[PDB]
Amino acid sequence: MERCGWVSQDPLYIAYHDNEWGVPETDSKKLFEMICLEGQQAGLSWITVLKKRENYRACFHQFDPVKVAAMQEEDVERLVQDAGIIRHRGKIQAIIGNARAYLQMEQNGEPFADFVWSFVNHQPQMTQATTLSEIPTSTPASDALSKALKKRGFKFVGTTICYSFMQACGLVNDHVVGCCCYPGNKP
Fold this sequence. Notes:
CATH topology: Endonuclease III, domain 1
PDB class: hydrolase
Largest sheet: 2 strands, parallel
EC number: 3.2.2.20
Protein name: DNA-3-methyladenine glycosylase 1
Helix content: 55-70%
Catalytic activity: Hydrolysis of alkylated DNA, releasing 3-methyladenine
Pfam family, one: Adenine_glyco
Shape: globular
Number of helices: 8
């Protein structure tokens, strides 16, 4: 019974990987935070986002996403001092736009999660590499997906951020040969 291999120390990797990662999510609420939390990954590491992810919900959840879309510029300036999360003002203002553009699209009752991963032609992708290194961090859907979010007005959508969201959701099935029971390795 073996799974992954780059995971080591910092139980956040396994704890988060076991909690999700590899499990395609269609919930706009859960998926909406996935792309938003990773957005801060720029320069930071996915592991660091998990720690701030909990701190982010501590201050943001208190205001409820509704206020985040109709909050005030003085609100973000207040968190810059007391918050416990990455402070940059610009990064915070970006989250506000996400809540505004997110509600605008949902206002029509259109599902946000179904659109982001549907770009795969309603046909999830799978991989058959021996290690994660062989897996590419830039897949055809990642480049096309990032371009779609750009239209919504979302920033920090580089192909690297989209790839991280792809692995977090589960669109691509990552499983090194011999992972618990990876098939396809037959003669």
